[PDB]
Amino acid sequence: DIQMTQSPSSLSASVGDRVTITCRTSQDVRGALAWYQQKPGKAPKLLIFDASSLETGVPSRFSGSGSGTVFTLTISSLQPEDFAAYYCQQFLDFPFTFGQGTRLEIKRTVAAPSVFIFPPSDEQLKSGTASVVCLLNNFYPREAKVQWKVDNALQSGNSQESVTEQDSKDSTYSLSSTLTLSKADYEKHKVYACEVTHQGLSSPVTKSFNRGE
Amino acid sequence: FLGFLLGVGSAIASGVAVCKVLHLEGEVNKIKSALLSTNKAVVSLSNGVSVLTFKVLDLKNYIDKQLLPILNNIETVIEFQQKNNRLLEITREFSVNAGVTTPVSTYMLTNSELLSLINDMPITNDQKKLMSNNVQIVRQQSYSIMCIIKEEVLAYVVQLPLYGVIDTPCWKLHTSPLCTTNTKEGSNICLTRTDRGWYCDNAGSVSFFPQAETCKVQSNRVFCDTMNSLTLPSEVNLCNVDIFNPKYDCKIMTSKTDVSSSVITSLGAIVSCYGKTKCTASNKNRGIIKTFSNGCDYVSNKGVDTVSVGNTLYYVNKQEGKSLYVKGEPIINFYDPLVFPSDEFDASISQVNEKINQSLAFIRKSDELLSAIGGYIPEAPRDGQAYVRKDGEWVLLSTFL
Amino acid sequence: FLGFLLGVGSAIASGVAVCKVLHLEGEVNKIKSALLSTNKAVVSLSNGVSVL
Amino acid sequence: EVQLVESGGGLVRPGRSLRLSCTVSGFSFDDSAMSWVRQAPGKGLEWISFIKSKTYGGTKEYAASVKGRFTISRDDSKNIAYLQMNSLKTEDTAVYYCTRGAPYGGNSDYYYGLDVWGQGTTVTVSSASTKGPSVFPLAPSSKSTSGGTAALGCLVKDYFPEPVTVSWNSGALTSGVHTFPAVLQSSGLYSLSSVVTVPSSSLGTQTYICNVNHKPSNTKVDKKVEPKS
Amino acid sequence: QNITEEFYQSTCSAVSKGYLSALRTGWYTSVITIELSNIKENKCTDAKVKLIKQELDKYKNAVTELQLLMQST
Ligand SMILES: *[C@@H]1O[C@H](CO)[C@@H](O[C@@H]2O[C@H](CO)[C@@H](O[C@@H]3O[C@H](CO)[C@@H](O)[C@H](O[C@H]4O[C@H](CO)[C@@H](O)[C@H](O)[C@@H]4O)[C@@H]3O)[C@H](O)[C@H]2NC(C)=O)[C@H](O)[C@H]1NC(C)=O
């Protein structure tokens, strides 16, 4: 197979800015690069074929360039419609392997998250499991680190994160990390803490609770 | 291809008509008095026809006013040259072209003056817009007939085009030879559509231009000339979708010359690869992307940059558009090569089918009379004695007994 | 004589292709920046083709 | 005019078989080549298979990830292209798109891109059965609500298959609501959380009820979320 | 705009649809005038007069050539 490597994987930019996504290949594909636009959930759309040739119906702001190993996709003046995912594909020989993908997000001023923690309900404890929920509400940028501390012991392999899309109004993200434990393991300890590390906060915020209150 | 079917017309016949009108006495004075105040005016001549009039250079009000009193600083020299150079170049262009020049040069009529003439032309605003945005094409379709130089003005008529048909749909037909693909050399037969050229809708019929070299194209707009056109019925377009339609007899051309060639279209390329010729279609980055088999095939410009047939390299047009490949059996396979009329130029589908019925008729009829016209007895030997009929011969009757 | 047996081609198709490439944004600035020092240079366009 | 409609998706047990069918409408199917590309939940695009036109043989080209398990085929008589999925894993759960390979010219065995794309069909491979959800409140504290603006929510746990509709106060509460995307748990069942930010002063007085509707099991659950003690 | 093209394999031909007409149907005539001055001869040996005199010679020879050209239509 021929190796595809897109750079960068994530890109933050505002409307009217000039952006450039790069696609590196392992071999000389002889200018057989393709650029596609995929909006979340919808089918991808062929934007650029050959090296620089533009597919019919694609606006003039989309430019393709590069040759041999490095290929560049350029958007001259950004529009609110161009914020989506972009994939490069090789068409030298089979397999027609795809690229890594590039998420294109709307740039915004930094906003520290609102941290909350929710203990497991009494209705759930009667069933056998326990789910402790930590919520990071309305923050930017996307990158955030969440650590669970049970009796000040860091946990790994039991949390499961889930993040919302960029808000269409304020352009902020919201994250929900769920720590899953057994009823016995939950009732063995007493202090449960969620440590949030993010760029907007100078020091990591640790929201915690104790079994009972 | 079908340019011989066109008529023959006199191009500047209209302008010369106005030209000879200016030769009459006093006619030039009407113009000189009309332009005595302004530089542009409307003059209705003796025959009632109204024409625009323009004074582009006034050496009288320079030589008699600014130059004469000195003859009765150095800058005055150069100023004269700048004023006189146009008169010289207009002279040069005339003295070579025998008084009739085309296209109309910038010396004969600058862009400002031409746009002024278009602005005062008595036609619609849409035509003013069209002629103003395409002045280079209007120049190529205009003439400059030198008329008279009478006391004391120089005069030439500029014959401008009038576009009475605008914004109707047009389409260009490209054709190429369609031959069979046998292994023997002289065994193949060829057929080619001759109706290639430009077509435009016009007054419930179609204007056909067989010499597409004379039609000029800017963007998606086509400036053609009706003088070298043909007024065909609307049904002519059927020849593209149904060549065997009875309502229109489509024109073809037969031969036996199976040579390889290519016809670059607006959005692609036709390749007729016959014989041992090697024909390919190539891309500027990938290289060869198709090796044509024997026959007539097509390749769109979507991703193709060059097309090579034999020793010939063609660059295809990189215009944006959708190209559609319509499948179909090559109609040349519908013909029997043993009765195919191979010397046909001004031919058509029905003319070829009727020559085939006629060629076939004589064989079935000659066999219908000759086979068997020997089923009858001939004439007995015409000597003295009598002959009776025995087996297939005339036996001497005297043998009984 | 046998001129009808010839094919039909576009003469300026290549130059017009380079022309349509020159309409793109920044394409003219690459040339103006390349010839800012000398009067002659070799420039590779966006599609990789190198032209004088 | 040009349309690709893939069909035949849905639920299938791990190790079973499922045949996807892509119907082409709008152009000549015989002259064109078809390809299958899938996208896993949360991951990028993955190229799966490719079948050439009749003109250039009948060559089926597969990707390394599904070679030997998947099989592409075509029926030109009815303008359809199949993707037979055998020996299915849980990793094959994805959205399957049907695409058309664009020849480098009008007709050529070299392709520059995927011209037309179908809208896709969702294929879920899981051993799990149909199951309603359990709703648990993510209640705040009744002693020390933080900030002036507090957040509360509902935890919709252990349900199959996707998806569930979560509303707050029967549709009256909309501002500040974040219903997170579902996450597949280690048990094979899904679980999501839907939260909402409300003023802290309304916590002790206002009633907040989340309404979860689960169509696959026909389960309607309204859970009132109130602080502890 | 929005240009199309179709290729018919049965007849080995191609049609390029999507163009607009601009046919020349008739003619329109306009008269352009250049007013000249009736100067009989350069009636007048310094440096500047030599140039102005031969430039007037260019003018008179041009109108003479146009007079010879006018002798036919
Ligand atoms: C020839 O005719 C065509 C029409 O037949 C026409 O070109 C059209 O121009 C418009 C201009 O806006 C195009 O509209 C947009 O095109 C972009 C290109 O990527 C699309 O992304 C847009 O889709 C949006 O729709 C989603 C719906 O939810 C949005 O959420 C999202 O933001 C998408 O961006 C939108 O369609 C139109 O696509 C073309 N169409 C074609 C066929 O070219 C024009 O008159 C002529 N063409 C030219 C080049 O002049």
PDB file of N, CA, C and O in Angstrom, chain B residues 107-159:
ATOM      1  N   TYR B 107      -6.169  52.803 -36.756  1.00  0.00           N
ATOM      2  CA  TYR B 107      -5.952  54.057 -37.470  1.00  0.00           C
ATOM      3  C   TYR B 107      -7.218  54.511 -38.189  1.00  0.00           C
ATOM      4  O   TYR B 107      -7.545  55.704 -38.200  1.00  0.00           O
ATOM      5  N   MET B 108      -7.941  53.570 -38.801  1.00  0.00           N
ATOM      6  CA  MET B 108      -9.171  53.923 -39.498  1.00  0.00           C
ATOM      7  C   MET B 108     -10.253  54.361 -38.520  1.00  0.00           C
ATOM      8  O   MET B 108     -11.024  55.282 -38.811  1.00  0.00           O
ATOM      9  N   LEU B 109     -10.317  53.724 -37.353  1.00  0.00           N
ATOM     10  CA  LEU B 109     -11.359  54.029 -36.375  1.00  0.00           C
ATOM     11  C   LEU B 109     -10.895  53.526 -35.015  1.00  0.00           C
ATOM     12  O   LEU B 109     -10.784  52.314 -34.812  1.00  0.00           O
ATOM     13  N   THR B 110     -10.616  54.449 -34.099  1.00  0.00           N
ATOM     14  CA  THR B 110     -10.161  54.070 -32.771  1.00  0.00           C
ATOM     15  C   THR B 110     -11.303  53.448 -31.969  1.00  0.00           C
ATOM     16  O   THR B 110     -12.470  53.461 -32.373  1.00  0.00           O
ATOM     17  N   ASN B 111     -10.948  52.895 -30.808  1.00  0.00           N
ATOM     18  CA  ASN B 111     -11.950  52.253 -29.964  1.00  0.00           C
ATOM     19  C   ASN B 111     -12.959  53.262 -29.432  1.00  0.00           C
ATOM     20  O   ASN B 111     -14.152  52.959 -29.345  1.00  0.00           O
ATOM     21  N   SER B 112     -12.503  54.464 -29.071  1.00  0.00           N
ATOM     22  CA  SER B 112     -13.434  55.487 -28.603  1.00  0.00           C
ATOM     23  C   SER B 112     -14.442  55.843 -29.687  1.00  0.00           C
ATOM     24  O   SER B 112     -15.650  55.908 -29.429  1.00  0.00           O
ATOM     25  N   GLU B 113     -13.964  56.034 -30.917  1.00  0.00           N
ATOM     26  CA  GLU B 113     -14.849  56.400 -32.018  1.00  0.00           C
ATOM     27  C   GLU B 113     -15.794  55.258 -32.372  1.00  0.00           C
ATOM     28  O   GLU B 113     -16.972  55.487 -32.676  1.00  0.00           O
ATOM     29  N   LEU B 114     -15.297  54.019 -32.333  1.00  0.00           N
ATOM     30  CA  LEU B 114     -16.144  52.869 -32.635  1.00  0.00           C
ATOM     31  C   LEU B 114     -17.220  52.685 -31.571  1.00  0.00           C
ATOM     32  O   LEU B 114     -18.379  52.397 -31.893  1.00  0.00           O
ATOM     33  N   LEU B 115     -16.855  52.842 -30.295  1.00  0.00           N
ATOM     34  CA  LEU B 115     -17.852  52.776 -29.234  1.00  0.00           C
ATOM     35  C   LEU B 115     -18.861  53.910 -29.349  1.00  0.00           C
ATOM     36  O   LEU B 115     -20.040  53.727 -29.026  1.00  0.00           O
ATOM     37  N   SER B 116     -18.426  55.081 -29.826  1.00  0.00           N
ATOM     38  CA  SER B 116     -19.371  56.169 -30.063  1.00  0.00           C
ATOM     39  C   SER B 116     -20.354  55.807 -31.168  1.00  0.00           C
ATOM     40  O   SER B 116     -21.561  56.036 -31.030  1.00  0.00           O
ATOM     41  N   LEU B 117     -19.854  55.240 -32.270  1.00  0.00           N
ATOM     42  CA  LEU B 117     -20.742  54.827 -33.352  1.00  0.00           C
ATOM     43  C   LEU B 117     -21.728  53.766 -32.883  1.00  0.00           C
ATOM     44  O   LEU B 117     -22.902  53.783 -33.273  1.00  0.00           O
ATOM     45  N   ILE B 118     -21.272  52.830 -32.052  1.00  0.00           N
ATOM     46  CA  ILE B 118     -22.179  51.813 -31.528  1.00  0.00           C
ATOM     47  C   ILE B 118     -23.220  52.446 -30.611  1.00  0.00           C
ATOM     48  O   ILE B 118     -24.391  52.044 -30.607  1.00  0.00           O
ATOM     49  N   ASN B 119     -22.819  53.454 -29.831  1.00  0.00           N
ATOM     50  CA  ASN B 119     -23.741  54.084 -28.890  1.00  0.00           C
ATOM     51  C   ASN B 119     -24.872  54.824 -29.600  1.00  0.00           C
ATOM     52  O   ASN B 119     -26.003  54.846 -29.099  1.00  0.00           O
ATOM     53  N   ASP B 120     -24.597  55.432 -30.753  1.00  0.00           N
ATOM     54  CA  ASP B 120     -25.605  56.166 -31.509  1.00  0.00           C
ATOM     55  C   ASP B 120     -26.263  55.320 -32.591  1.00  0.00           C
ATOM     56  O   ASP B 120     -27.048  55.851 -33.384  1.00  0.00           O
ATOM     57  N   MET B 121     -25.970  54.026 -32.636  1.00  0.00           N
ATOM     58  CA  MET B 121     -26.578  53.164 -33.637  1.00  0.00           C
ATOM     59  C   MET B 121     -28.054  52.948 -33.306  1.00  0.00           C
ATOM     60  O   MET B 121     -28.407  52.745 -32.139  1.00  0.00           O
ATOM     61  N   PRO B 122     -28.935  52.980 -34.304  1.00  0.00           N
ATOM     62  CA  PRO B 122     -30.388  52.844 -34.056  1.00  0.00           C
ATOM     63  C   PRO B 122     -30.839  51.395 -33.904  1.00  0.00           C
ATOM     64  O   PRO B 122     -31.571  50.836 -34.729  1.00  0.00           O
ATOM     65  N   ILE B 123     -30.400  50.761 -32.820  1.00  0.00           N
ATOM     66  CA  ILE B 123     -30.773  49.394 -32.483  1.00  0.00           C
ATOM     67  C   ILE B 123     -30.954  49.290 -30.972  1.00  0.00           C
ATOM     68  O   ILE B 123     -30.843  50.280 -30.243  1.00  0.00           O
ATOM     69  N   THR B 124     -31.243  48.077 -30.502  1.00  0.00           N
ATOM     70  CA  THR B 124     -31.605  47.869 -29.107  1.00  0.00           C
ATOM     71  C   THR B 124     -30.389  48.014 -28.194  1.00  0.00           C
ATOM     72  O   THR B 124     -29.236  47.993 -28.632  1.00  0.00           O
ATOM     73  N   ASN B 125     -30.668  48.154 -26.894  1.00  0.00           N
ATOM     74  CA  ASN B 125     -29.596  48.223 -25.906  1.00  0.00           C
ATOM     75  C   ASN B 125     -28.830  46.911 -25.811  1.00  0.00           C
ATOM     76  O   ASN B 125     -27.626  46.920 -25.536  1.00  0.00           O
ATOM     77  N   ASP B 126     -29.511  45.779 -26.001  1.00  0.00           N
ATOM     78  CA  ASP B 126     -28.826  44.492 -25.960  1.00  0.00           C
ATOM     79  C   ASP B 126     -27.765  44.406 -27.052  1.00  0.00           C
ATOM     80  O   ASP B 126     -26.650  43.919 -26.816  1.00  0.00           O
ATOM     81  N   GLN B 127     -28.076  44.927 -28.241  1.00  0.00           N
ATOM     82  CA  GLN B 127     -27.094  44.933 -29.319  1.00  0.00           C
ATOM     83  C   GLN B 127     -25.963  45.909 -29.028  1.00  0.00           C
ATOM     84  O   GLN B 127     -24.803  45.635 -29.357  1.00  0.00           O
ATOM     85  N   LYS B 128     -26.280  47.062 -28.431  1.00  0.00           N
ATOM     86  CA  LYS B 128     -25.226  47.984 -28.019  1.00  0.00           C
ATOM     87  C   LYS B 128     -24.274  47.319 -27.036  1.00  0.00           C
ATOM     88  O   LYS B 128     -23.051  47.438 -27.168  1.00  0.00           O
ATOM     89  N   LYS B 129     -24.817  46.584 -26.060  1.00  0.00           N
ATOM     90  CA  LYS B 129     -23.978  45.882 -25.090  1.00  0.00           C
ATOM     91  C   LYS B 129     -23.101  44.850 -25.785  1.00  0.00           C
ATOM     92  O   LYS B 129     -21.889  44.774 -25.535  1.00  0.00           O
ATOM     93  N   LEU B 130     -23.703  44.054 -26.675  1.00  0.00           N
ATOM     94  CA  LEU B 130     -22.960  43.004 -27.359  1.00  0.00           C
ATOM     95  C   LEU B 130     -21.832  43.583 -28.206  1.00  0.00           C
ATOM     96  O   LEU B 130     -20.692  43.106 -28.153  1.00  0.00           O
ATOM     97  N   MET B 131     -22.132  44.614 -28.995  1.00  0.00           N
ATOM     98  CA  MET B 131     -21.112  45.210 -29.848  1.00  0.00           C
ATOM     99  C   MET B 131     -20.059  45.954 -29.040  1.00  0.00           C
ATOM    100  O   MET B 131     -18.904  46.046 -29.471  1.00  0.00           O
ATOM    101  N   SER B 132     -20.422  46.477 -27.865  1.00  0.00           N
ATOM    102  CA  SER B 132     -19.461  47.226 -27.065  1.00  0.00           C
ATOM    103  C   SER B 132     -18.490  46.303 -26.345  1.00  0.00           C
ATOM    104  O   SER B 132     -17.313  46.643 -26.184  1.00  0.00           O
ATOM    105  N   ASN B 133     -18.960  45.136 -25.898  1.00  0.00           N
ATOM    106  CA  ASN B 133     -18.065  44.220 -25.204  1.00  0.00           C
ATOM    107  C   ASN B 133     -17.172  43.428 -26.151  1.00  0.00           C
ATOM    108  O   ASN B 133     -16.165  42.867 -25.703  1.00  0.00           O
ATOM    109  N   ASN B 134     -17.497  43.380 -27.439  1.00  0.00           N
ATOM    110  CA  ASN B 134     -16.750  42.579 -28.406  1.00  0.00           C
ATOM    111  C   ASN B 134     -16.332  43.427 -29.600  1.00  0.00           C
ATOM    112  O   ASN B 134     -16.571  43.079 -30.757  1.00  0.00           O
ATOM    113  N   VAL B 135     -15.666  44.552 -29.330  1.00  0.00           N
ATOM    114  CA  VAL B 135     -15.293  45.452 -30.418  1.00  0.00           C
ATOM    115  C   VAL B 135     -14.250  44.826 -31.335  1.00  0.00           C
ATOM    116  O   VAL B 135     -14.215  45.128 -32.532  1.00  0.00           O
ATOM    117  N   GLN B 136     -13.399  43.946 -30.809  1.00  0.00           N
ATOM    118  CA  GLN B 136     -12.411  43.297 -31.668  1.00  0.00           C
ATOM    119  C   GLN B 136     -13.092  42.418 -32.712  1.00  0.00           C
ATOM    120  O   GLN B 136     -12.745  42.469 -33.906  1.00  0.00           O
ATOM    121  N   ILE B 137     -14.170  41.748 -32.317  1.00  0.00           N
ATOM    122  CA  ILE B 137     -14.900  40.909 -33.250  1.00  0.00           C
ATOM    123  C   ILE B 137     -15.684  41.769 -34.230  1.00  0.00           C
ATOM    124  O   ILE B 137     -15.746  41.464 -35.427  1.00  0.00           O
ATOM    125  N   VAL B 138     -16.266  42.873 -33.752  1.00  0.00           N
ATOM    126  CA  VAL B 138     -16.983  43.776 -34.648  1.00  0.00           C
ATOM    127  C   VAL B 138     -16.035  44.333 -35.706  1.00  0.00           C
ATOM    128  O   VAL B 138     -16.391  44.444 -36.884  1.00  0.00           O
ATOM    129  N   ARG B 139     -14.807  44.664 -35.307  1.00  0.00           N
ATOM    130  CA  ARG B 139     -13.816  45.107 -36.275  1.00  0.00           C
ATOM    131  C   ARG B 139     -13.549  44.021 -37.300  1.00  0.00           C
ATOM    132  O   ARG B 139     -13.455  44.295 -38.500  1.00  0.00           O
ATOM    133  N   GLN B 140     -13.464  42.773 -36.856  1.00  0.00           N
ATOM    134  CA  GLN B 140     -13.180  41.728 -37.829  1.00  0.00           C
ATOM    135  C   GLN B 140     -14.333  41.502 -38.800  1.00  0.00           C
ATOM    136  O   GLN B 140     -14.113  40.936 -39.873  1.00  0.00           O
ATOM    137  N   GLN B 141     -15.540  41.942 -38.459  1.00  0.00           N
ATOM    138  CA  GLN B 141     -16.705  41.793 -39.320  1.00  0.00           C
ATOM    139  C   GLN B 141     -17.101  43.088 -40.022  1.00  0.00           C
ATOM    140  O   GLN B 141     -18.200  43.167 -40.582  1.00  0.00           O
ATOM    141  N   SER B 142     -16.235  44.098 -40.004  1.00  0.00           N
ATOM    142  CA  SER B 142     -16.514  45.392 -40.601  1.00  0.00           C
ATOM    143  C   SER B 142     -15.547  45.661 -41.746  1.00  0.00           C
ATOM    144  O   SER B 142     -14.444  45.109 -41.801  1.00  0.00           O
ATOM    145  N   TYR B 143     -15.976  46.523 -42.665  1.00  0.00           N
ATOM    146  CA  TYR B 143     -15.161  46.940 -43.796  1.00  0.00           C
ATOM    147  C   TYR B 143     -14.917  48.442 -43.740  1.00  0.00           C
ATOM    148  O   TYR B 143     -15.610  49.186 -43.044  1.00  0.00           O
ATOM    149  N   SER B 144     -13.951  48.885 -44.541  1.00  0.00           N
ATOM    150  CA  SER B 144     -13.616  50.302 -44.659  1.00  0.00           C
ATOM    151  C   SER B 144     -13.414  50.584 -46.141  1.00  0.00           C
ATOM    152  O   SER B 144     -12.355  50.284 -46.700  1.00  0.00           O
ATOM    153  N   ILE B 145     -14.433  51.149 -46.773  1.00  0.00           N
ATOM    154  CA  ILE B 145     -14.396  51.462 -48.195  1.00  0.00           C
ATOM    155  C   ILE B 145     -14.015  52.917 -48.352  1.00  0.00           C
ATOM    156  O   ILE B 145     -14.709  53.802 -47.852  1.00  0.00           O
ATOM    157  N   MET B 146     -12.932  53.189 -49.054  1.00  0.00           N
ATOM    158  CA  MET B 146     -12.554  54.588 -49.266  1.00  0.00           C
ATOM    159  C   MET B 146     -13.440  55.186 -50.341  1.00  0.00           C
ATOM    160  O   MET B 146     -13.626  54.571 -51.392  1.00  0.00           O
ATOM    161  N   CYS B 147     -14.049  56.337 -50.081  1.00  0.00           N
ATOM    162  CA  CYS B 147     -15.011  56.887 -51.042  1.00  0.00           C
ATOM    163  C   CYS B 147     -14.357  58.012 -51.831  1.00  0.00           C
ATOM    164  O   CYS B 147     -13.807  57.791 -52.914  1.00  0.00           O
ATOM    165  N   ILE B 148     -14.455  59.246 -51.320  1.00  0.00           N
ATOM    166  CA  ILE B 148     -14.043  60.428 -52.073  1.00  0.00           C
ATOM    167  C   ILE B 148     -13.161  61.340 -51.224  1.00  0.00           C
ATOM    168  O   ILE B 148     -13.114  61.247 -49.989  1.00  0.00           O
ATOM    169  N   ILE B 149     -12.444  62.211 -51.923  1.00  0.00           N
ATOM    170  CA  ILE B 149     -11.648  63.262 -51.331  1.00  0.00           C
ATOM    171  C   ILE B 149     -11.998  64.543 -52.081  1.00  0.00           C
ATOM    172  O   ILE B 149     -11.252  65.005 -52.951  1.00  0.00           O
ATOM    173  N   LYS B 150     -13.129  65.138 -51.722  1.00  0.00           N
ATOM    174  CA  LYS B 150     -13.673  66.288 -52.424  1.00  0.00           C
ATOM    175  C   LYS B 150     -13.449  67.561 -51.614  1.00  0.00           C
ATOM    176  O   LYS B 150     -13.413  67.538 -50.382  1.00  0.00           O
ATOM    177  N   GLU B 151     -13.287  68.676 -52.334  1.00  0.00           N
ATOM    178  CA  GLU B 151     -13.075  70.013 -51.779  1.00  0.00           C
ATOM    179  C   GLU B 151     -13.973  70.317 -50.583  1.00  0.00           C
ATOM    180  O   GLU B 151     -15.151  70.643 -50.762  1.00  0.00           O
ATOM    181  N   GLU B 152     -13.452  70.180 -49.364  1.00  0.00           N
ATOM    182  CA  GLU B 152     -12.030  69.945 -49.102  1.00  0.00           C
ATOM    183  C   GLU B 152     -11.891  68.966 -47.939  1.00  0.00           C
ATOM    184  O   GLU B 152     -11.251  69.264 -46.929  1.00  0.00           O
ATOM    185  N   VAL B 153     -12.513  67.799 -48.091  1.00  0.00           N
ATOM    186  CA  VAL B 153     -12.588  66.793 -47.041  1.00  0.00           C
ATOM    187  C   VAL B 153     -12.242  65.419 -47.605  1.00  0.00           C
ATOM    188  O   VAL B 153     -12.405  65.155 -48.800  1.00  0.00           O
ATOM    189  N   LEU B 154     -11.723  64.556 -46.735  1.00  0.00           N
ATOM    190  CA  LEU B 154     -11.458  63.159 -47.053  1.00  0.00           C
ATOM    191  C   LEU B 154     -12.553  62.301 -46.431  1.00  0.00           C
ATOM    192  O   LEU B 154     -12.969  62.545 -45.295  1.00  0.00           O
ATOM    193  N   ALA B 155     -13.014  61.291 -47.170  1.00  0.00           N
ATOM    194  CA  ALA B 155     -14.170  60.513 -46.737  1.00  0.00           C
ATOM    195  C   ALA B 155     -14.023  59.027 -47.040  1.00  0.00           C
ATOM    196  O   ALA B 155     -13.622  58.631 -48.143  1.00  0.00           O
ATOM    197  N   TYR B 156     -14.351  58.202 -46.049  1.00  0.00           N
ATOM    198  CA  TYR B 156     -14.468  56.768 -46.254  1.00  0.00           C
ATOM    199  C   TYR B 156     -15.619  56.233 -45.418  1.00  0.00           C
ATOM    200  O   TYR B 156     -15.877  56.720 -44.314  1.00  0.00           O
ATOM    201  N   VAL B 157     -16.316  55.239 -45.962  1.00  0.00           N
ATOM    202  CA  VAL B 157     -17.464  54.623 -45.307  1.00  0.00           C
ATOM    203  C   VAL B 157     -16.983  53.406 -44.529  1.00  0.00           C
ATOM    204  O   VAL B 157     -16.218  52.587 -45.048  1.00  0.00           O
ATOM    205  N   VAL B 158     -17.436  53.276 -43.286  1.00  0.00           N
ATOM    206  CA  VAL B 158     -17.133  52.114 -42.457  1.00  0.00           C
ATOM    207  C   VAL B 158     -18.395  51.266 -42.371  1.00  0.00           C
ATOM    208  O   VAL B 158     -19.382  51.659 -41.739  1.00  0.00           O
ATOM    209  N   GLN B 159     -18.361  50.102 -43.013  1.00  0.00           N
ATOM    210  CA  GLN B 159     -19.498  49.190 -43.069  1.00  0.00           C
ATOM    211  C   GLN B 159     -19.454  48.276 -41.849  1.00  0.00           C
ATOM    212  O   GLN B 159     -18.634  47.354 -41.785  1.00  0.00           O
TER     213      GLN B 159
END
